[PDB]
């Protein structure tokens, strides 16, 4: 149908922009943040792919939770996630963010950031290599490529 | 007289009425005082440009100079009052009585 074709093309255009312009928030918690710096480094330049760090949560699309989330820190993480405007995505990086990590059975550690925020991608490792984090970012881009919001709305 | 001069004089009168009727802040009174000189500048330059009084064109600049000298004086007095009392309220300037 003509309307179906138009909405397919339009939401392919919109998904392309979001995929090709990813702005992670400047937010790193523990040793997993050093591998984010090495992904930003010249060897695995993330700026090639349109991935650019922004300090303010209002100007970020991806939250890369990279490090241990403690009980004293979980409210701040949820606050900044809420302050990020939509559409927004979450990449939990490393064992501490994924599950508990080395600190799973601890009184002061949240067992997974997915208890606090809805996580889209899980990147395993302690820490994941810069290539592993880059593969996670590319997998997130391919996940965005499949979103069909206008195609759902037209049939809604 | 055209209606333009009427509007400028009315604006000056409005600014004069604004200064004489304080509300709480001294800063708002200073803003009203600066508006009066803006209206005076506009009126004087309108009069001078219309009669081709060539040598009088330097008058509005001197008007502006002493305008901002007064603004500087008012800002200095305002900072001293704020340092003394904590706020720029005109109610605190009540130690001296008539």
């Amino acid at each position: 149908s003509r309307g179906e074709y138009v909405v397919a093309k339009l939401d392919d255009l919109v998904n392309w922009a979001r995929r090709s312009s990813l702005w992670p928030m400047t937010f790193g918690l523990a040793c997993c943040a050093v591998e984010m710096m090495h992904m930003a480094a010249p060897r695995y330049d993330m700026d090639r792919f349109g991935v650019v760090f922004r300090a303010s949560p209002r100007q970020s699309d991806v939250m890369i939770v990279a490090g241990t989330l403690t009980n004293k820190m979980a409210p701040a993480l949820r606050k900044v996630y809420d302050q990020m405007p939509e559409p927004r995505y979450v990449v939990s990086m490393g064992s501490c963010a994924n599950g508990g990590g080395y600190y799973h059975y601890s009184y002061s550690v949240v067992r997974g950031c997915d208890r606090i925020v809805p996580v889209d991608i899980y990147v395993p490792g302690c820490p994941p290599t810069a290539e592993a984090l880059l593969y996670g970012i590319l997998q997130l881009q391919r996940k965005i490529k499949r979103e069909k919001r206008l195609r759902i709305w037209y049939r809604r | 007289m055209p209606l333009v001069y009427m509007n400028i004089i009315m604006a000056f009168a409005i600014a004069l009425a604004g200064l004489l009727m304080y509300r709480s802040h001294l800063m708002s009174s200073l803003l009203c005082l600066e508006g009066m000189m803006l209206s005076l500048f506009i009126m004087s330059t309108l009069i001078i440009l219309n009669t081709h009084f060539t040598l009088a064109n330097m008058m509005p600049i001197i008007l502006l100079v002493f305008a901002a000298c007064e603004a500087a004086l008012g800002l200095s007095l305002l900072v001293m009052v704020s340092n003394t009392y904590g706020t720029d309220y005109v109610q605190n300037l009540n130690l001296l009585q008539c």
Binding site: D45, R48, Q59, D61, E86 | -
Partner: protein, 318 residues
Amino acid sequence: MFMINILSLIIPILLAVAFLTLVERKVLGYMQLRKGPNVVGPYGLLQPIADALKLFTKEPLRPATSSISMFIIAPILALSLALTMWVPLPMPYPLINMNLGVLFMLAMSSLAVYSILWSGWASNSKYALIGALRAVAQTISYEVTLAIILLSVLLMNGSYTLSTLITTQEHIWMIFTSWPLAMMWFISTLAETNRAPFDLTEGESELVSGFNVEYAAGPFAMFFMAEYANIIMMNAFTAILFLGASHDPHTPELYTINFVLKTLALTITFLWIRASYPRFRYDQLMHLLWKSFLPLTLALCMWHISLPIMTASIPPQS
């Protein structure tokens, strides 16, 4: 036809702003031993388009504590003045030919100051207020120094008309004539456009994005567009004012090519400086202009008042 000329002045400026974003990314990358964007399109040419579409399809929010009226007006004023500053520039023919074309640009810049002040105050957040006050101090210092430097340079010219600037620079360059004022003017334009080392209103290291911390989606894109348009416009003004190009009335394209090349060179110098230097402190910036530039600026103003008289080289009034 005048509306057509306005559109021809507006739309290419926005396109040049987007590709200046791309160019700055790539230049900083290659100076930092990276490649910069090269994946989105051929040599990353579609990156600005992707960024613009993403920003304007993202959700913009008004903070609960914000003053909505001045929250909206500020990006509008910023972009409007950024586009307006281009109308008297001769390339080689201005869109709007003004007898006093320089004072117009000074006034419009001083008005463009208030966009960041009102956006910071309207946001009703502490980081925004701190950025706004940094803007106040920066504008104080650069404004006084810019006024006097422009006065002296135009005193070497005879009037306030940019076409007369071209006529003056027919033979040699104002950089050759008055290079010290050129250096101080370049620093003052850095301060005016809020570029490094003077990017204090939007200093990410101390403040989280500064005055536009609460701005998201479209209204943020408008601030970015306004800043980059100001960068290009100031570089073009510097190129016209100090690097004069030969003008042929029958084939004006040569002046346009030379003007564009010099503007691009100055913009690349801006990006180069950003990649090369640390950031000032704003008290140190205020003490830099008043205690270093202002004495030299006054002395050079006296020198450039006296020099035409003592050498019988007073420019024609018209």
